[PDB]
Symmetry: D2
Subunit: 312 residues, 4 copies
Amino acid sequence: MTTIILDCDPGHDDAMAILLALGNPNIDLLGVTTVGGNQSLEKVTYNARATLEMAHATNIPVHAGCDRPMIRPLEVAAAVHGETGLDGVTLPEPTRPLDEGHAVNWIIDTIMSHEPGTITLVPTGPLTNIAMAVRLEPRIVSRVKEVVLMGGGYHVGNWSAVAEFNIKVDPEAAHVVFNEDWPITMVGLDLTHQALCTPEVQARIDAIGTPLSAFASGLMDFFRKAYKNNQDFIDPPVHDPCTVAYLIDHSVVQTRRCPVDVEIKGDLTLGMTVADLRGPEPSADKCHTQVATKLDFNKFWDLIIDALKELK
Amino acid sequence: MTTIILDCDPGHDDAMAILLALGNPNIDLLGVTTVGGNQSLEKVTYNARATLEMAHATNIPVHAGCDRPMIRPLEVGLDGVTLPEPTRPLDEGHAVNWIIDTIMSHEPGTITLVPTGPLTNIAMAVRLEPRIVSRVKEVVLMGGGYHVGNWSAVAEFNIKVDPEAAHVVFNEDWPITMVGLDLTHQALCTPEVQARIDAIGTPLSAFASGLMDFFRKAYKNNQDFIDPPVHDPCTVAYLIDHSVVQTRRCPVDVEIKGDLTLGMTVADLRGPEPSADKCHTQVATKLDFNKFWDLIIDALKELK
Amino acid sequence: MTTIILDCDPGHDDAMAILLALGNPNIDLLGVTTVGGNQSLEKVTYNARATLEMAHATNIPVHAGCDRPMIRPLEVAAAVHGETGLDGVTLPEPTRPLDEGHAVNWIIDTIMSHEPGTITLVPTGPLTNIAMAVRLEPRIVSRVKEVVLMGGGYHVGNWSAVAEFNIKVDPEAAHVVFNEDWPITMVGLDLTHQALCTPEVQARIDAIGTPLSAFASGLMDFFRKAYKNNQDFIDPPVHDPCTVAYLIDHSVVQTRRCPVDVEIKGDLTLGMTVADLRGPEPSADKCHTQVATKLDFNKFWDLIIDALKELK
Amino acid sequence: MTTIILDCDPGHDDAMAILLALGNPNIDLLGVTTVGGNQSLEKVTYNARATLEMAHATNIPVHAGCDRPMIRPLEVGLDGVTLPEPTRPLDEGHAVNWIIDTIMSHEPGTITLVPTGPLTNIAMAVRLEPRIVSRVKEVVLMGGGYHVGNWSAVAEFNIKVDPEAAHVVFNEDWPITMVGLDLTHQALCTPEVQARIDAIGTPLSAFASGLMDFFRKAYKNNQDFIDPPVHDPCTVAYLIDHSVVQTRRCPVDVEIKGDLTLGMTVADLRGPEPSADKCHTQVATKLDFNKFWDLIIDALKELK
Ligand SMILES: [Ca+2]
Ligand SMILES: [Ca+2]
Ligand SMILES: [Ca+2]
Ligand SMILES: [Ca+2]
Ligand SMILES: [Cl-]
Ligand SMILES: [Cl-]
Ligand SMILES: [Cl-]
Ligand SMILES: [Cl-]
Ligand SMILES: [Cl-]
Ligand SMILES: [Cl-]
Ligand SMILES: [Cl-]
Ligand SMILES: [Cl-]
Ligand SMILES: [Cl-]
């Protein structure tokens, strides 16, 4: 079956990815690992545990990982007295204490103890934990089935004209990940900007009528608030769960093989995922990387809705 | 009329741009200036003069310019056609000084610069005489690409040859239209286009058809193209009729420090199209294929 | 008593540092950790264990660390089938097996389990293991007493006009190390180029008349061979043991406090340790880094000779 | 004797270099050219003309050059002295064109370029007319530092203002002497030096002493100096008498991509000194303090 480690930084988008992974029976979520850099490790680790608590999934391990980028300095806003959890919603306090041990060591021990070719890594934050794991244990690379990450963009940027937040937070770590010989699917902004939270989608979620569906709808209210000054969007996109959607059903997220590398020296282009789209599509044999292109909007939202129904 | 200086490096594409500029009555070609870097200054200067001779445009000045990029090292008569020997001698003086003297002696807002090679002469002119910038009506250059590269995944040849010079040009306060690969890759030399050109039945139409044979040869191993694109004349096509080359305003800057992204024209396409007041740069987007080829064919017919 | 972890890549220079650390009673060698990048991890790990065996230090743990730089690609010469050990000398086969576990995790566990302010890190290879340890456990940084590394050069380069080998192999890892708030002594080429293996020094070593003194003299024969085409040297320098010499007696290795950072983006200047020598020497309070300047030649060689005598 | 073009940005240091060039009979000052970037072109051009007026050198041409760096953005009387209004009008024409025309019209191997500001005019001249390079006898510039920086830990102001232009200059095949901070930091304006200048007792010696008062003020918070250094005139001192400014041949290039090291003149001092045949660049090392100040004092006396 599809057996995953979800490496994330919740994050309202990551919370939606957690719900999809838990609610779909074709996904075996081995555990959650967290990474600081976009926001503080402490904040996102709490949010991951509280989200899992909300879904009665406290039997899923959570391990905290790296709190800053490999090389460049940490750039997160100062912690606020009177902020816990995810903005705009309420989550129960986690009943299980955080599992002990660094996420990087847990990722390594897990991959080395399971059969080769069975674990899929699903990074939806900066790539720091993944890069660190690779360097600490190079033998994980050939053992991993696939890496399906939310990050980048071949013709679209958000943080800059050409670069995306997860990659730019730790471009060096991204460079490591993209230059290892493992199969990678880059679920970038080109794809995720199609995953629009339209009124009709949200109404179908609202109608489920459970605490979890109300939670998911609350996440979508936050996306709308976050995107309120962004005139490219009437309705906001949701990013991270598109990775899990791809793994559930490849037809939901079309892909195109191409070389992809990360720019780590440029002024204007720092953090760009440079996709070489010249010439015809190379074979999987010749090209270990592929970019996500076209979303099946209708099937994507059906996956979300079905997962929320299954969780009850 | 639009009055132009064509700064170029012929180059079979540039030769087609020269023919379009001469053959269309809405273009007043003030003169040709040449730039080395993509190919040798000596080769392209000869080719420019000989192309003008082929079109009986012996009244058009040619001045040779810079022979290498501003900063990076130099890394370097048209194949497949025959050109008459020029009857007009090469005009004396550096192209950079001629561009400057011409812009300073003509009324402000009347001259449009049309660079179709590396941007070295334009950047050098700007630095040697900063007063040219507000006097120039527009710069319409063949170069770059917002979502398409050829030399690399993200960068185009004219820009990458001299990224520093391109940086200078894009960061001056003058109106710029970037006619990049996104646009020019639509200007396809189909069998039907070439057959219409062949039917004109003159030495010049045979010359143009020869240029098109070269494009095909240059692109023969490029599987993105059944038929080859033609680049440089799209700049002149835009100036003849804006409807032929649609544009989208956006900030554009040139990457000069990146490993992978060297020479990239970085176009900020986030948010809505800003106004001309707020944004001096625009990228070429959509070609009117039918009208574009009609301009070329009509120019070739007009030249007789 | 200075208690050290020697992180190294033997390397004939590192072998001399091991002998000095073992032979001087003011040094407590907690263990040896190894790093690949300058040469292969497998080669230098064997060499470290065999050197320890030669010096009857079978009680000293060895842990193998990272086999390549953090970010940039591995650039080490192709292996030769009739090479084991250190060129030009013979070492006994190690009787103690390689200790299990990654050096990075061992460095972390050791620093976290010992009292704060007691362990001094002594890196004499690329800085990869040290940088990795810092990122995997940020709590080690304030606990470390001092870092005394062989690397860099403020006004002298060897690999380039301005940069030194250990730093250039992994400039990113060096950047990490130099930008943490721990006290650093940079024992660079400015210093080590004074540690000259003159005929008189080597004759005094030869006269000790033991297997170990012959081994040390053999290391010095290799230095001479390595430097044979280098016209800046009549006699070759020895590098790595100058770190241990500084720790034994500060008067042997004078130092000057100054800001030091590592250039990781330059064309010509890649791997340069940029020392700001403008203005007067700042206080230890204000400046955590210092560069080694002047060697006491006579005292340095006395330390080496005395250590070799003590080992018998 | 040595025939020079002094390309400068006065600047109190440059003013001292002008006085030395004029006052020493082994120097033939062909003319002065000015460059903006460290300070504004308008300010330094006026200051150059007024300094020449102060020294009764109204026969010396001044041409204004570039007002900003080649690529990077512009970031910009003489304080503490009084200068007469220039009686000679600014000579017409851009300095870059004047430098080119002068080098091309004089016999090869006779003109020495002496840049004491950013290298923008020199780089621009080289690119506009590559034939100047082999014709120039030598370039002796004030800039850089092999083991000393001032603007940064490793870089010096003139180079960092326009690192690209410096890169151009250092990578042409002409003989270069880099008179950097390693050298100029020895040219100390001690009380005894200044007392000897004061004793000359003329308007010009008072002017020179005023320049020295400014150096002291500029360096008042710099604890590496009890007495301030003077920079630019060390270039002219080298040309008067090589024994005053010792040199060491070595490869020198300019870092234009680094974060920390931007503008560094990277001198490769590994191995023995290569021959003049093999190595076109050399760095200034040791100043003869006593002889240097005697040259300055003698020049001031000669000017009356
Ligand atoms: Ca996320
Ligand atoms: Ca062209
Ligand atoms: Ca070593
Ligand atoms: Ca100056
Ligand atoms: Cl439904
Ligand atoms: Cl397929
Ligand atoms: Cl074909
Ligand atoms: Cl419009
Ligand atoms: Cl404790
Ligand atoms: Cl002895
Ligand atoms: Cl002290
Ligand atoms: Cl600058
Ligand atoms: Cl003072």
